[PDB]
Each structure stands twice: as C-alpha cells, then as structure tokens.
Write a protein that binds this ligand. Structure first.
Ligand SMILES: *[C@@H]1O[C@H](CO)[C@@H](O)[C@H](O)[C@H]1NC(C)=O
Lengths: 27, 49, 49
C-alpha cells in the first residue's frame, strides 16, 4: 500500500500540568 | 492436613497500586475541612502535603 | 530403586503410606528431581521376589 512520512503523534507522557517550559522526556 | 507447614496451602492477596499518579478516586478515609485560601496553611490534597 | 506403579506418587516430600514411611523417605526440605519410567519390558517375567 502507499507510504507516508509524518511529524505528528505526540502524546502527554504524564498526568500533570506544565506551561511556558520546554520539557525533555523519554517514552 | 498431614503435610508439614511448608507444604500447606496459603492464600495470598497482592494489593498493587502506583502512588505518584495525579488523579485518584480510590480512597481516603480522612475528613475534609474548610479550604481557607489566601493564608499560610499546612495543606493535604489527596495525600499530597 | 524399583517400586510398584501405585507407589510412584508416594516418592514426594510430605507423603505417607507403606513407602515414604518406614521405607525410603525424602526430606521435606528437598532440592532435586525424581525421574521415573516403566520397566515392565525388562521385568515382565514372573520373578516373584
Ligand atoms: C514527506 O513528508 C512531506 C510532509 O509530510 C510530504 O508532503 C511528502 O509527500 C512526503 N514524502 C513521502 C515520499 O512520503
């Protein structure tokens, strides 16, 4: 079938609220 | 019933839970009080103190 | 050793009967394996004792 190349699909790796920060996470 | 203690059946219940998760509705037997607001207090919100 | 088939289930920790009691007995704190096979093809003759 056809193939595609996306930069989408992020998800929240945690259950807390963060704002105006750059957070480095691994998952 | 004739076996030694090490070979008798034992009933095991394992209670598994994660404690650092943000929401929780499972438990808490302590009574709540009035939320004071705008004043230095010692607070306990869902186990977080 | 050579045993009767009805006795094979008796060669185990904690068991009692006419074997594993006033006969070859395994410890309750036993580490090891009990390996057994049917020997009738060699012992089918009427040897008696
Ligand atoms: C590569 O990605 C871009 C942007 O998603 C898309 O427009 C383009 O068609 C893609 N190329 C291939 C071969 O998938």
């Amino acid at each position: 079938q056809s193939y595609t190349n996306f930069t989408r699909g992020v998800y929240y790796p945690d259950k807390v609220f963060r704002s105006s920060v750059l957070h480095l996470t691994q998952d | 019933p004739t076996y030694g203690v090490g070979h008798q059946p034992y009933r095991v219940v394992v209670l598994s839970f994660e404690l650092l998760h943000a929401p929780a509705t499972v438990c808490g037997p302590k009574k709540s009080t009035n939320l004071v607001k705008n004043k230095c207090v010692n607070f306990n919100f869902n186990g977080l103190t | 050793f050579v045993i009767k088939g009805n006795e094979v289930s008796q060669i185990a920790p904690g068991q009692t009967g006419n074997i594993a009691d006033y006969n070859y007995k395994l410890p309750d704190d036993f580490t090891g394996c009990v390996i057994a096979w049917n020997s009738n093809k060699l012992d089918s003759k009427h040897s008696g004792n």
